From a paper:
Here we provide a full characterization of the pathways that nature deploys to assemble peptides with β-lactone warheads, which are potent proteasome inhibitors with promising anticancer activity. Warhead assembly involves a three-step cryptic methylation sequence, which is likely required to reduce unfavorable electrostatic interactions during the sterically demanding β-lactonization. Amide-bond synthetase and adenosine triphosphate (ATP)-grasp enzymes couple amino acids to the β-lactone warhead, generating the bioactive peptide products.
Author numbering: 1 to 485
């Protein structure tokens, strides 16, 4: 179904630009469909067929885009071997998926019994296999991975029909047209790339710009302007990087960015105001998940500090209240007819997450007077603060910016309860006095009515992008029934 929809678009504008890479390469819609059809031809030539699973160990390239579409066209299913997978995690990922082959384009050590590796470029046959009339695949076409757990990530599978419907709904709500140019600086291994940029552009007849996820933010900022991008999605940390790179300099030319989307983590009022002042854009808040697709956003071209989102037209939302005291504050529960098919081989996770027709996000949202919803963070991160429930990322940003710490991680002190007690792990700035740390910390905590148990340490587990790994911090210092660790 995905190939078909792509082919219809290509037929109307065969010679229109479809994909541009930051470093020069390009393809029209007709050229891209030819590459897909030639990649289908080579995949068939290598014994791949419907139902097979194709693991991918690949950098961002037009060829990787064609491979995804070729897989979908022949009724195969692709799965990324995430770049942070080491040899052991590759073995595990292979045990869970059982792929027919690993398509590779860079040196990498695979485990001993791995499926055969095939170099990406050699899958492009010289002679294209035209898609035959009467061929359509509506079922599974991809396995994807969760993120942010200390465990091996959970496998998610999507059907083509549900994905295509979900993307068309978002594209309608969001106002995407063929005029748009999507700037994608994430690895194609993740839905942040493939959903918000690749299929968003191609199912629209728009243009996709493939950038290097490893490029420094100054480089990406020049490229966002040069390539005239109108739409992109990035994490808060990515916008903070952009801002820092541009702060104090004459503003970049981001005038074409009518859809600068941000989601995936806490986006503060200060981040949004910063982006306006430094980058001269109004960041548009979005919200979703690889499990669900896109659920909410705020496409208004205003500074969105202190403003929430609304459901994507066709998505249902309710709050499961944390307490009958505050109905406007609860776990966010979502309703859709076109989500993923859930988790592979994880019965506990599916049971807690897919409860019938409903999708339980495990995130805390709040309604505001204006009827919008602000997603505040994980339910497991709620603190009972002055002024209502407060989510730890909020306190983390406050402490980090106002106190002489190199980093901080705030967690609720006790696993099961909603308390004003915070477990506060501080990495002290060794250059600054300790009394200055505790005065500054006391101020933040008192601003929120919080009680804290403080753990000073420079032995912080970090994520690969340098943030505290709060799950590992909790497993070490969380309190028990008999007292503090």
């Amino acid at each position: 179904m995905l190939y078909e929809a792509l082919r219809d678009i290509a037929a109307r504008r065969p010679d229109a630009r479809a994909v541009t890479t930051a470093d020069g390469a390009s393809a029209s819609y007709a050229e891209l469909l030819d590459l897909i059809d030639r990649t289908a031809a080579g995949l068939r030539g290598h014994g791949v067929g419907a139902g097979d699973v194709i693991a991918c160990s690949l950098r961002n390239s037009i060829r990787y885009v064609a491979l995804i579409l070729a897989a979908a066209r022949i009724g195969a299913r692709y799965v990324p071997l995430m770049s942070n997978f080491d040899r052991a995690d590759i073995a595990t990922a292979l045990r869970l998926t059982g792929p027919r082959m690993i398509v590779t384009d860079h040196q990498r050590e695979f485990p001993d019994q791995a499926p055969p590796r095939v170099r990406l470029e050699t899958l492009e046959a010289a002679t294209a296999s035209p898609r035959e009339a009467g061929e359509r695949y509506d079922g599974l076409f991809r396995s994807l991975w969760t993120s942010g757990s200390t465990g091996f990530p959970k496998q998610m599978v999507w059907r083509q029909d549900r994905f295509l419907r979900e993307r068309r709904r978002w594209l309608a709500d969001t106002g995407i047209t063929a005029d748009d140019v999507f700037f994608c600086r994430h690895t194609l291994d993740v839905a942040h790339a493939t959903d918000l940029h690749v299929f968003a552009a191609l199912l629209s007849g728009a243009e996709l710009v493939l950038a290097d996820p490893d490029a420094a933010p100054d480089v990406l900022l020049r490229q966002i302007a040069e390539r005239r991008a109108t739409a992109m999605s990035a994490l808060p940390r990515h916008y903070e990087e952009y801002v820092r790179a541009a702060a104090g300099r004459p503003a970049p030319d981001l005038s074409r960015l009518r859809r600068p989307l941000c989601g995936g983590a806490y986006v503060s009022a200060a981040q949004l105001t910063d982006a306006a002042e430094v980058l001269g854009i109004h960041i548009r808040q979005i919200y979703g998940s690889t499990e669900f697709g896109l659920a909410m956003g705020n496409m208004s071209d205003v500074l969105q500090a202190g403003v929430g989102m609304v459901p994507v037209e066709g998505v249902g939302v309710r709050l499961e209240p944390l307490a009958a005291d505050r109905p406007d504050l609860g776990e966010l529960v979502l309703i859709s007819d076109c989500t993923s098919e859930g988790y592979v081989g994880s019965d506990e996770a599916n049971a807690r997450t897919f409860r019938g027709e409903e999708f339980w996000t495990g995130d805390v949202a709040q309604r505001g007077p204006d009827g919008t919803l602000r997603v505040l963070g994980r339910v497991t991160e709620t603190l009972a603060a002055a002024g209502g429930p407060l989510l730890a990322p909020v306190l983390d940003e406050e402490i980090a910016a106002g106190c002489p710490v190199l980093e901080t991680a705030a967690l609720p002190a006790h696993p099961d309860r909603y308390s004003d007690e915070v477990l506060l792990v501080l990495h002290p700035d060794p250059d600054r006095p300790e009394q200055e740390l505790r005065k500054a910390v006391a101020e933040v905590l008192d601003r929120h009515g919080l009680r804290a148990s403080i753990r000073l340490t420079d032995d912080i587990p970090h994520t690969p992008v340098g943030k505290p790994d709060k799950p590992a911090l909790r497993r070490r210092w969380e309190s028990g029934a008999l007292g503090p660790v």
